[model samples]
Target: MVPISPIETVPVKLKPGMDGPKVKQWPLTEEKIKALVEICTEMEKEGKISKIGPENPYNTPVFAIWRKLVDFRELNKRTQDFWGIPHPAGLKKNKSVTVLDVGDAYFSVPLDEDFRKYTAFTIPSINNETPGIRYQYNVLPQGWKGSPAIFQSSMTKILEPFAAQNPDIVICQYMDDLYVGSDLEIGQHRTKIEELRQHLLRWGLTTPKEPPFLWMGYELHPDKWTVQPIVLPEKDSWTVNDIQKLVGKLNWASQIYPGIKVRQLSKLLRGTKALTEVIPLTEEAELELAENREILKEPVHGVYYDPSKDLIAEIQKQGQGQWTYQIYQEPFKNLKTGKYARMRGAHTNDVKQLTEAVQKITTESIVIWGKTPKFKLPIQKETWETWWTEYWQATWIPEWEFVNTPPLVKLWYQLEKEPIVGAETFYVDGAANRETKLGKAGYVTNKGRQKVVPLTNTTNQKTELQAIYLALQDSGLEVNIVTDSQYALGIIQAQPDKSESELVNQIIEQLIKKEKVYLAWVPAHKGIGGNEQVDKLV
Candidate 1:
């Protein structure tokens, strides 16, 4: 392979319109025309683009931004659309972030030989008295409809092996930029960056030296992250087209600045259907734009996200009688002198906010707390029941659980040393290690049938119930089940309507199926042979 050859290739597929008339080139200064000629000549020499004959039948006009030739709007409208460029918000935020920039980002990916004619762009003649000369991109052209998606997919394909090899290091691609992130192991992180750079060098791609670094338009520093400021158009009166562009910039910045809101410009946004509509800039709109710009300039911090941590939503009374809630990933990087990321926080005017809070969590199980001013109870029991049955899969902690007698203190009062008389006695237990967050359920029968199983993301309450469920599944027709967990026993006997756990509900169904099933409580870690044996298995 040639050193400067394309690292990947993708075809430019478009609809069947090959004989369209050439687009008219916008008038440019003599200096820009001369510069574009030189650029095209250099690009042709490097095989980045190739000169095409005037009879090519397809030509798109080119305008210069001086360094880069743009104006593919007409051609882009005919090109087939492609998708799947990842959003920058989904990129991992780590203690160490290394950004890799491709040289001539789009040019690094060569277009298929047959599709080059579809990308032909004509530059105005030098003296303005002759016909324009045409050239076609040998590489992917910037401003094309499908260039970003094609470039992103090609880059990701080439780097797939590297990503697989280094599972701990996160590699995120947003079009031309690649981000390498890992934990704060200074030496290891530095070594990983160098290794990645060396890998890219094999394909003739070189990253710029690491100073004045930016990723997805965010300025990155050792301890600060901020959105790069945008230059506003200076005019006393603005057109709808201009304000629309400004709104787009603010909306993009808001993803990183979390607190930025463009809602204040709602009136201006809904002004008219036509882009030609001219509206005098009001003081309110001007101040809102200025305030948003100031926020974009402020230093920001990235909140870390851990999928393994518990997602909790805390709902509490804010002032007088209004209720509010904040969703958090517990033990995440400190956001406000506390180690948690506040994923979302807003007023709970209705159950929609509460429902939205649950929807934000990816895991099937969540822990929700609604406290202070007695939680208000949502006024409609049917609504609460609907949310509980259909919408909420969270392990809800009711306010009454805090005030009432807990199963823990109540169960200890009636702990027995001896096993109950029955056809067959079985001891079951569930144990979870706090440090490792690993849970296990085990049960042993007097007849010697026994098994121990591992559980995922479970609690002591859950594992204890699991143990009884497993015991019931493997036991004979008649049996007495003994458990050390009072919570599990209480949950089984509780009203079906009050029970929020599906596992407890399943256990109830099993109890009804059996001819005789006795549930007895035993003091944990007592000198009972069966309890000691099952405890070891867990």
Candidate 2:
């Protein structure tokens, strides 16, 4: 029997002037030790790895994760990096694409004999019955960082000629994941598939099973691409280890779930780093998780884009200042039915991303045609700056000038206790429209002293200052003022000389007289009692 992959053997190259220290192996239960025994037996039987002397200078711990053995080695950090793994191939529209799940992909590559000693791993004894043993891999290991790049480069070289001969069939390789697609009917498609299979066999590789419907973790259909639904452990309180496991699964699934937000994942991981630490699930994280579940319920648009077909890139303002651009492939004409298939849409917010997607598709087509296609995309005309200038409105540009005696800014967000709307405490707010140059200043107190006054030729900051000025006019001395405008707070703190706005100077005058008036920032529109009332008045 031929070896799985005989294309090329590669050495594990470590960075110069680096040494890998031998580490202690983690203890495993009897069940885990039994699993390791089974795994090691298979590898040893296939001549993939062999027992090594205990004196091996370089050794790392071996542990099992979900029954799969992983060498917990720091080899990756000391190893030199390699590049040239090709970008994932985009599937073509109206093509019958079959994914070949290459089993034992990393194991297929042979490791250079000279570097085999460096890849040694120690497996601990089973309850002192059997002695601990060290083993070294003769083939590439699963967790090694350098294996993917090297394997991809070698595999590409081996299949280059076969790919060239069958120009009609589009072959895509993402390391071990292989894809073969064409417009040919089922009978002819299999013919090409088998032909490529034979070529792979020559290099000691085999297509292990029937063609998989899944490609790079996505279940592809004529209508759309999908992934298996995520199954999280049901628990209100979970240890860090459990959460880490769930995150690992979700992180993989998040890629295929189009437009899925991951802010909740960050929230879920808040506080605590140790694996044994326990945390109660917060409502915010739970809501986010539910949102992700909702998003994953449906498949993304079914159509794989065809670069040859006309692309429709249209941008729509989804909401205030939020533009969503969607790229659609013009409907594909079914040759047999003579009917137009529904177009699939690709969605994005970034203009550069849209252009890059187009450019990449066009570039792929250019590679085939050996020249630029006669395609002109009717993209919305305007530079990003011009587009932003049309929509982005700047209300205020601050000019800060400090006087000799500037009052200390006392504005803060936190309150030691619930703010009581007494004779001294007041909520102030200001509203302004720069276009209309209309501004209103308002203040509200628990004593029923509330008023709204309009200010002519006043900006938002000026109105905020005016509101604070009005609040200071109350009989209560050394009052507590709460406002949402940090701009006004900053302006009043800096007692700029006569050149600055008169309203700001008036507030500074009040602050200077009082010597110490407490100013705080309350978030606007949060339904804070006095703040809300003052906001309505303003």
Candidate 3:
């Protein structure tokens, strides 16, 4: 460890895109380049920092970049005054400051071609199928031999300029460590932050939009106060339902919170199921009851009386006569046990002792109940919704099998209008050879069965459109068409023109101009009574 004092001056220049020895060329996307430029611009305006070397000789691994940027910013901000730099807006200085400590990055290695090649060359035991091979490209492995040294070296290099400019600012290079002043004020802290931002920008880095990231179970403010769980804008707007959903999401991520105990403080919100119930006779409850009982036993005491009172009096003759004996008795008890029990008597000296004893017992009992298991109930609706949404997105829908058979069309006619429903079945040779087919062609209904309109189109989407048209024609009734295909639905809605078979489009135009059909999108697989019956008949 080097002493963080006596700053030195080192002149350096900006060295962008200068590849140093041992540094690998990593691909950069256009978005990443734009982000880098934006970050630099924001920091440059703050004036707390200056660009150092361009094409700098130092070669750094990818993993160390973001962290180094954070470190450099902090050092520059702290030492800004020493460098005779004026503070920027939203920056503060402080006698004492607290740092919000964000935890270490848990980034997994990418399974890109470069990583695969690297692994094949390095480890003999790692075959292509080995699970660890996928992570060989990651630089921040927990057990890697050079992890700490590599991190520290990168951070020191980033902070070198600030350290040279102002020696007073302290830098601790361990992951997410923040320094606070012994007694920091608000304005001073702001000044420090402004300077920090400038320095980070100069080095092509940016701070997170959220400030004072959590570190060591406490959110440290620039003004030197420790806060708990600072809420950001997105969180602030969340309703009770939203919060409940968040809790569920957090519970799912509990691997990171292993051994953490959380207690449910209230009932579940409306429309949510309770996952857990409160336990009876908790440690807190028992201790409180015991304390109350102790308080009631007023003046319960034991005293001893001395038998040699005369001898004590003779010795005290030079001063004063004294007599002592140990007294023994119950402190106090209510004479009437029935209705008078509700009344609390005046506090006498004896009562005071009993009360003190009760307080002490309660305190000790609470201390004894260490690390009790916490109970939590599902309390947020948002949690359930979030869980369901995520589950639905991740699950794959099973493919349906079609049997080869005559095309079926079912038509229902009303007094004023007629509507048609149609479906086709394909024969399945066996369970292994089940086929799926879709068309609005031959369907059987109580009214009668009708032939499906053939689609002479290239695309499957066009075929779906033709089916709708055929149903309208067969029914000869004003009816609504519902389909699962978003593409077909959009065409019916007519917001955007979709390419469909010419025949299908012609049929659709006739139906629309005649005002005989409407279209809608309904949820699938929901067992909707009408849809289900229609599907079965088809």
- Candidates in order, TM-scores: namely 0.52, 0.52, 0.21
- Residues forming the 10-long window of minimal summed lDDT in candidate 1: 405-414
How does candidate 1 score on lDDT?
Answer: 0.61
Error of 2 at 103 (Å): 1.3
Which residue runs does candidate 2 get wrong by more than 4 Å?
Answer: 1-5, 26-42, 64-68, 84-90, 124-131, 209-218, 223-300, 331-538
Overall lDDT per candidate, in order of appearance: 0.61, 0.60, 0.32
User: Candidate 2's residue-wise lDDT over 79-186, tens digit each?
Assistant: 777872221223455457777766777777788788788878877777867768778888878888778887787788888998789888888776687878788898
lDDT of 2: 0.60
Better of 1 and 3 by lDDT: 1
RMSD of 2: 16.2
**Residue range 332-386, candidate 3, lDDT tens digits:** 2111000001113221112122223323323322332211111111112343333
- In candidate 1, what are the lDDT values of residues 1-538, reduced to their tens digit? 5464346466556767643335767787888888999999998999888887856877677777768566777776777767633433223357787777787787777787877787787778866798887888887787777778877787777788877888889887765788788875969998988888777766666666453456556655554444566666767667777777776776655544434445444457673888676676567656767776676565455443345544343343222122333334443322111011222322112344333433433221222111121222222454455445543245452332121211111110112224446667778988877766688887888888887889778777778889999988888767788888888766554323213367865776676567667778888877666774345345
Supply the TM-score for candidate 1.
0.52
Stretches > 4 Å off in candidate 1: 1-8, 17-21, 26-29, 84-95, 126-131, 209-302, 316-325, 330-349, 360-538
